[PDB]
Design a protein around this nucleic acid. Structure first.
Lengths: 106, 55, 56, 88, 271
RNA sequence: UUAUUAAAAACACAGCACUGUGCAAACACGAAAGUGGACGUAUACGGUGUGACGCCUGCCCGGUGCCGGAAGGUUAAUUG
RNA sequence: CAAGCUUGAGUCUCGUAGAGGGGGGUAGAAUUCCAGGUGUAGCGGUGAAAUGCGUAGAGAUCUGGAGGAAUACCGGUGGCGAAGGCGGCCCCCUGGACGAAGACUGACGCUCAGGUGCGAAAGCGUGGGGAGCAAACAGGAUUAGAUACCCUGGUAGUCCACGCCGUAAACGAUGUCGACUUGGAGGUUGUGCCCUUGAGGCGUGGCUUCCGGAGCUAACGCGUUAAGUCGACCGCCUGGGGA
């Protein structure tokens, strides 16, 4: 069971669908005997460059330990979900439960 | 320990136009320079950093 | 190389600052480098020669 | 390569001890396991020559170990080639 | 697989045939067969209206479900079957309620795969959805041009259509001909692309192989007499005229599409 | 294949190319209805030329045709 | 021949660095093209020109879209790979190298005719794709001529999948393996020690760049990564042409 770091941006108009998305994703991750190391809702952030003629995207960060099947399903969900304008899954060497700088700033 | 989410630190190693500064200017090790380049590219993908000064 | 002419500065100093910024950005050297194709062997030989002459 | 658990299992079932990781039987068994595992990878990646070079290195190393074992003690050689399913 | 026959005969030298070991070796599903009598290219006046048609092997018509209007109910593929009436292969599917139907077999489908139609179906090859529920950029086949009419585009072997844009009640499609066409979003399409893509690699090899498919020989117009064809006769091989159809219409270049009714749907003609 | 003076190097052919055709398809037979094409859907269908395979297929868009262009010139019924 | 031994050669434990390979996805900058807005007489190109595009509205600028290819900065006599080669980011599969402390097998090794495999670019076959570049080709120039250099276009090709080809100044013009022989300055990657003072100092490995001592060499130069002193095996040479 490998560790992953999931970051996905949501359409700014879909900010209230973000709690439901997070709920579904944690449900899918823990249903498959997986853990969630870190979950951070960064909220809306000004984009450094326009993405799909948009500015001010909604950022979410996840650190999960899950098998590859659920991660493939999550990537497919991100690809087919039209609200998620951009996402990126990355492997990590170990579990990360330290607050990221985005929320460490406060 | 270079993190692509540490934009405050990454902005010190990019010019005013968004380009990565060479290791000869900042005098950082080659290993941590490679880590910084990877982190800056990832942060550019996540739209946390600009690719150029235009967009 | 964006230059915003700040208040209480003449035009000439703003133009000289713009030139200094555009030369530190190296845009002219790059656009002169990219106008013709340089074979990989040619660029490798040129880089090797420059690294050799950078020894004095 | 092989996981730690699979390697430990092979060393235990093919070795004279849990620490006898250098025996000819253990080495040949580990090489055979790695070759059989790689077989499935190369069924899907027929254009991976760089990894097939390491595969052929493993094959030749197992061949040399089997030759040394057959020249040393043929009884253990036969037991090994029957327990592993070799001889073409 | 694509296999070349060994030249044990002059007629077998160039034959290249397509073999598919997963096709059903047996009789087709009887409750889905119909009589398909040949025509020889004759219309109800008994006149030849389409030349070079005649003979060939007797064929039974398979009732293929092009509408795919059995929504919500999952189905499993029993087997892939050969169909003599089309270039593609067909799959016999079994719905959960016990109904069996014939569908065009998409690429990658095999016995045991599960498909489903409807607005709630998953996005995977074999599923059928209204095109407004299909992501832009995806590759589909068996496309309708009127809602509920049945698939009419991209039905041949290996063909497909990609949705390039969606706006309002219409979507824009890039057909296999390279033409951009507008189709209203309520039309349905099946995900993936039609299987049997290597159908175009086959080589018939001999003249008789085309006769089995009901294709009669084509006589060149220049080989006839002036009374028979505009390309006429001449002492020896003479042409000296612009190429035309047997009825005098200029071929090799002259556009013949004249349909002002459907021009509003053609975004850009093929090229 | 010229029933009944010509069986061939002629026709066909698999293959190749060009071109038309988005489906109420082009096209064909039909004053029309309709039918064939096809219960097919561009890996499909029609037309044209060439004629397995091998190595290949150079130059010319002035003429004729076809395709595209739409500014300008010219120009029908109509209008008066 | 028999029995040993661990130092050569391998196996296991834990980590480290890497454009090593194969598959899929995605991102931004730019070129080109399509549609539209503004706008008007030039643009492009050159030593100078002309061919070419442009009053049918070009070039410039702004907006939207399509498509393909390559990945600026990082970037570096830097890194990985047997060689050819490998450069955005992410995921999946995967080979090798190195280091620390141990345990294990116990010569299992080196080289290798024939044999097999990999092998830049160009080229070939089938099916796609085709923005840029560009053999052939066309036109404009230059010229005594110009089948060239220069300019305007432009097909194959370059790109993808699968096969073939098996050649390069495929070079370090330096076969592989092992041992020994003064040094200096660096680079890169592990590891150990010490109020760790510090981005510290001192050791110890791997790879790597430059200079240089003895020695060697016809000389140039090589010089612990030898072209020095040796050992094992292989390939190759016997005047220039013909070839």
């Amino acid at each position: 069971m490998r560790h992953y770091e999931i970051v996905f941006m949501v359409h700014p108009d879909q900010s209230e669908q973000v709690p439901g998305m997070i709920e579904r994703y944690t449900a899918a991750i823990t249903g498959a005997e997986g853990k969630i190391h870190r979950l951070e809702d960064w909220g809306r952030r000004q984009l450094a460059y326009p993405i799909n003629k948009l500015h001010k995207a909604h950022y979410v960060l996840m650190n999960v330990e899950a098998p590859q099947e659920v991660i493939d399903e999550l990537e497919t969900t991100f690809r087919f979900n039209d609200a998620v304008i951009r996402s990126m899954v990355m492997r990590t060497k170990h579990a990360v439960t330290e607050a990221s700088p985005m929320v460490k700033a406060k | 320990e270079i993190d692509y989410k540490d934009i405050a630190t990454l902005k010190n190693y990019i010019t005013e136009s968004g380009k990565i500064v060479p290791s000869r200017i900042t005098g950082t090790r080659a290993k941590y320079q490679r880590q910084l380049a990877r982190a800056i590219k990832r942060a550019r993908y996540l739209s946390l950093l600009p690719y150029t000064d235009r967009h | 190389p964006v230059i915003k002419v700040r208040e209480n500065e003449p035009f000439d100093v703003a133009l000289r600052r713009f030139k200094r910024s555009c030369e530190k950005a190296g845009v002219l050297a790059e656009v002169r480098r990219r106008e013709f194709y340089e074979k990989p062997t040619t660029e490798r030989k040129r880089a090797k020669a420059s690294a050799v002459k950078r020894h004095a | 390569s092989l996981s730690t658990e699979a390697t430990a299992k092979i060393v235990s079932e093919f070795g004279r001890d849990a620490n006898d990781t250098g025996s000819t039987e253990v080495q040949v068994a580990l090489l055979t396991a790695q070759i059989n595992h790689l077989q499935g990878h190369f069924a899907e990646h027929k254009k991976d020559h760089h990894s097939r070079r390491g595969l052929l290195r493993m094959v030749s190393q197992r061949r040399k170990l089997l030759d040394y074992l057959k020249r040393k003690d043929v009884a253990r050689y036969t037991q090994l080639i029957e327990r592993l399913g070799l001889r073409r | 697989a694509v296999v070349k026959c060994k030249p044990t005969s002059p007629g077998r030298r160039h034959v290249v045939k397509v073999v598919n070991p997963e096709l059903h070796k047996g009789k087709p599903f009887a409750p889905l067969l119909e009589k398909n009598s040949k025509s020889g290219g004759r219309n109800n006046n008994g006149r030849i209206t389409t030349r070079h048609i005649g003979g060939g092997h007797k064929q039974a018509y398979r009732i293929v479900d092009f509408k795919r209007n059995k929504d919500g109910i999952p189905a499993v593929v029993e087997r892939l079957e050969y169909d003599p009436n089309r270039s593609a292969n067909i799959a016999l599917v079994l719905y959960k309620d016990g109904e069996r139907r014939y569908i065009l077999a998409p690429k990658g489908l095999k016995a045991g795969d599960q498909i489903q139609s409807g607005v709630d179906a998953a996005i995977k090859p074999g599923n059928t959805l209204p095109m407004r529920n299909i992501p832009v950029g995806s590759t589909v086949h068996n496309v309708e041009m009127k809602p509920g009419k049945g698939g009419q585009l991209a039905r041949s072997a290996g063909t497909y259509v990609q949705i390039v844009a969606r706006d309002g009640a219409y979507v824009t499609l890039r057909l296999r001909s390279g033409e951009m066409r507008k189709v209203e979003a309520d039309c349905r399409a099946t995900l993936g692309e039609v299987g049997n893509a290597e159908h175009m690699l086959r080589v018939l090899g001999k003249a008789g192989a085309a006769r089995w498919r009901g294709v009669r020989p084509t006589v060149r117009g220049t080989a006839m007499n002036p009374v028979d064809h505009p390309h006429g006769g001449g002492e020896g091989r003479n042409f000296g005229k612009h190429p035309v159809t047997p009825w005098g219409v200029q071929t090799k270049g002259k556009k013949t599409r004249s349909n002002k009714r459907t021009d509003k749907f053609i975004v850009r003609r093929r090229s």
